[PDB]
């Protein structure tokens, strides 16, 4: 949700093309949908 | 991911001519002039009602064998040194276009002209023809059929089945995508998956590729009796209620309190069953189609040169000096292995396993008698028509009726776990 | 994280067809409840 | 009463996203009615 | 080490007097010019565009035509090197993946 | 590509360049020595 508001100000990488940074969070109701970029904080650029 | 495309023409087993007659070719081209069609090779059968028996097509494998011989002759025309696509008729067959998407009745002057003098066992490289080299996607799509044909040609005995295991395949929501087929029969899932692969090419390490590999692995483990409700893999297993059934199909199933244990590692290999009943075996041919698609998607290791016929040894795209060894298992003996593992587990009574074995023996005797009778009919036909000689199916021996170390291979599969 | 809870009626030794059950239909292990966030937050900020 | 009256043993389990699972099976407590029934059944066979 | 692609883009911005202060941190090469560029998503699509590793644009002119040039026979040809825009070409780390990218890419 | 959900007007356009070039060509035709004399110097300034 925060990433969705942050789009165009802070950038979040998505491991899968199908799932988007603006993808509704409610779609991510399960762990298997937890993003790999989301799973590792270090993987996400602190600068991004 | 396979990067080299080449094929070798089929060699007549002591025949001086391709073992097909114009009648057989017409039957194969019942309403179509493109052999590339998968349904062209086999009329899809749903099992139980599966298995096509015909005067020209005693088995679907018989039809595929005839298709292979016809394709081997026709393909040589654009693979001739000229590589011309429409100038001459091979048995009155003319390719419609340079891409050779379709074939047509030979022109009357061309019909008068002689057919292409195809040479047996001609190994060819796909890149040699320019139009195919021009379209990579087209070339890869055509290569699926070429790979299946080459694999059948490569096996002097029964065809091997490629099985690999990856836990990373378990990882992912693609597992949930596989779970979309939960409660589906193996055959139904295979037809849909094959259709999806036909729809588009996939990554050699593609999520679809891992899923197909998992499906094949589960089916084979279930077939050997390797995986059961009492031996579930993560609780996921293909389950067939009755072994030896006309269309017994392991169906994705879940068992609680019976999780199986698997050694960590990655294992990929091909096993070729000794029994000749595979012609009437829908699962084996479906597995062959999936394995061929898998080979088009990814370049597997070259199989052992000793594991391959000497003439075909050191095939650049298929045979290597060090490679996997084919595993030969009689279908009846393998069903016995499935029963024995369950008996050893104690899930089923010894009497029940014996009853299953008796049913299998009865089915095998009936099928063997029918195949031997077809063999006599074919020899009689060949004597009757030297001018129009043809083979309904690649010739078979009573030797194939034997187990051929099915038990040794079963121990090997158990060791593979 | 647990995904779901299921029940079995037969003894372990028996081998039988797995059939549809009520628990399987609901992915959620527990009954889902949606409530007014503002009211709860206000209560959390207002206790004496 | 939904079905499966012929159930040898009840068992219940839940599984994790990693796939680990927990199964709970209770031990059957006997019914006085059943033992009395067996005795009466033998008596009926003698006194039918 | 600093990003050569970044250095060249910064030269272009300064010449057009555009602000590259935002890209100044991006200027230092951290590990892979390709990796660093793949990470960056800022600026106009026109200013610089990379599809993953692949990026298609024009490199710097080999020759600069001056005002005196009359396209004379004695004048040396610049073979389109002088052209501010001559072509856009896709740079990428691996040829096989590049071809896969170009499987349906216009040729 | 545009970088904002609320972009600001940009004149660095091929169409804008085309419009400017066409105007400049016309202005030069106006500044033609054999064409400018007829047009009033005030009209010339206005047209430019």
Swiss-Prot record, chain B:
The keyword Hydrolase does not apply. The keyword Secreted does not apply. It is found in: Virion. Keywords: Capsid protein, Inner capsid protein, Virion. It holds the Pfam family Sigma_1_2. Its main location: virion. GO terms for cellular component: viral inner capsid. Interacts with protein mu-NS; in viral inclusions. Inner capsid (core) component. Belongs to the orthoreovirus sigma-1 protein family. This is Inner capsid protein sigma-2. The gene is S2.
Curated annotation (Swiss-Prot), chain F:
Disulfide bonds: none annotated. The chain holds residues 747 to 794 of 1275 of the full protein. It comes from the Viruses. This is Inner capsid protein lambda-1. Homodecamer; each decamer is made up of two conformers of VP2, called VP2A and VP2B. 12 homodecamers assemble to form an icosahedral capsid. Interacts with protein mu-NS; in viral inclusions. Inner capsid protein that self-assembles to form an icosahedral capsid with a T=2 symmetry, which consists of 120 copies of VP2, with channels at each of its five-fold vertices. This capsid constitutes the innermost concentric layer of the viral mature particle. It is found in: Virion. Coiled coil: none annotated. Belongs to the turreted BTV-fold inner capsid family.
């Amino acid at each position: 949700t925060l990433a969705n508001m942050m789009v165009g100000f802070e950038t979040i990488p998505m491991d899968n093309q199908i799932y988007t940074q603006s993808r509704r969070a409610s779609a991510f109701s399960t762990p298997h949908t937890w993003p790999r970029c989301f799973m590792n904080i270090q993987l996400i650029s602190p600068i991004d | 991911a396979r990067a080299a495309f080449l094929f070798k023409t089929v060699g007549f087993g002591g025949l001086q001519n391709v073992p097909i007659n114009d009648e057989l070719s017409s039957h194969l081209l019942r309403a179509g002039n493109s052999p590339w069609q998968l349904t062209q090779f086999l009329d899809w059968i749903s099992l139980g009602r599966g298995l096509a028996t015909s005067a020209l097509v005693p088995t679907a494998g018989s039809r595929y064998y005839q298709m292979s011989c016809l394709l081997s002759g026709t393909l040589q025309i654009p693979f001739r040194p000229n590589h011309r696509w429409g100038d001459i008729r091979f048995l009155r067959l003319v390719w419609s276009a340079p891409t050779l998407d379709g074939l047509v009745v030979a022109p009357p002057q061309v019909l008068a002209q002689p057919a292409l003098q195809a040479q047996a066992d001609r190994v060819y490289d796909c890149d040699d023809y320019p139009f195919l080299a021009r379209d990579p996607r087209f070339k890869h799509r055509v290569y699926q059929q070429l790979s299946a044909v080459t694999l059948l040609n490569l096996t002097g005995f029964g065809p091997i089945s490629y099985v690999r295991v990856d836990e990373d395949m378990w990882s992912g929501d693609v597992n949930q995508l596989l779970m979309n087929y939960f409660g589906h029969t193996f055959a139904e899932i295979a037809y849909t998956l094959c259709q999806a692969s036909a729809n588009r090419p996939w990554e050699h390490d593609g999520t679809y590729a891992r899923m197909t590999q998992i499906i094949l692995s589960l089916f084979w483990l279930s077939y050997v009796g390797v995986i059961h409700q009492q031996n579930t893999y993560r609780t996921f297993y293909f389950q067939c209620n009755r072994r030896g059934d006309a269309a017994e199909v392991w169906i994705l199933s879940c068992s609680l309190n019976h999780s199986a244990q698997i050694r960590p590692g990655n294992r990929s290999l091909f096993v070729m069953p000794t029994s000749p009943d595979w012609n009437m075996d829908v699962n084996l041919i479906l597995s062959s189609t999936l394995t061929g698609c898998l080979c088009s998607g990814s370049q597997l290791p070259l199989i052992d040169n000793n594991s391959v016929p000497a003439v075909s040894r050191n095939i650049h795209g298929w045979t290597g000096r060090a490679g996997n060894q084919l595993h030969g298992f009689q279908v009846r003996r393998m069903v016995t292995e499935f029963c024995d593992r369950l008996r050893r587990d104690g899930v089923m009574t010894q009497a029940q396993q014996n009853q299953i074995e008796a049913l299998a023996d009865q089915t095998q005797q009936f099928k063997r008698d029918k195949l031997e009778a077809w063999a006599r009919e074919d020899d009689q036909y060949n004597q009757a028509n030297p001018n129009s000689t043809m083979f309904r199916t690649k010739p078979f021996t009573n030797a194939q009726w034997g187990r051929g170390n099915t038990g040794a291979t079963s121990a090997a599969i158990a060791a593979l776990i | 994280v647990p995904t779901m809870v299921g029940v079995t009626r037969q003894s372990r030794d028996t081998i039988t067809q797995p059939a549809l059950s009520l628990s399987t239909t609901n992915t959620t292990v527990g009954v889902p409840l949606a409530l007014d966030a503002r009211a709860i937050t206000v209560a959390l900020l207002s206790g004496k | 009463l939904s079905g499966d009256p012929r159930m040898t043993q009840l068992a219940i389990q839940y599984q994790q996203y990693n796939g680990r699972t927990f199964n709970v099976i209770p031990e059957m407590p006997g019914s006085v009615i059943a033992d009395c029934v067996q005795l009466t059944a033998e008596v009926f066979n003698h006194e039918y | 080490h600093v990003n050569v692609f970044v250095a060249n883009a910064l030269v272009g911005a300064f010449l057009s007097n555009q602000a590259f202060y935002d890209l100044l941190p991006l200027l230092i090469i951290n590990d892979t010019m390709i990796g660093d560029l793949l990470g960056t998503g800022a600026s106009l699509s026109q200013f610089f565009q990379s599809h993953g590793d692949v990026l298609e644009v024009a490199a710097g002119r080999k020759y600069l035509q001056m005002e005196n040039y009359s396209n004379d026979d004695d004048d040396p040809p610049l073979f389109a090197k002088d052209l501010s825009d001559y072509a856009k070409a896709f740079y990428s780390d691996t040829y096989e993946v590049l071809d896969r990218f170009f499987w349906t890419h216009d040729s | 590509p545009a970088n904002v959900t609320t972009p600001t007007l940009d004149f660095t356009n091929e169409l804008t360049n085309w419009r400017a070039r066409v105007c400049e060509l016309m202005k030069n035709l106006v500044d033609n020595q054999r064409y400018q004399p007829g047009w009033t110097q005030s009209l010339v300034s206005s047209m430019r």
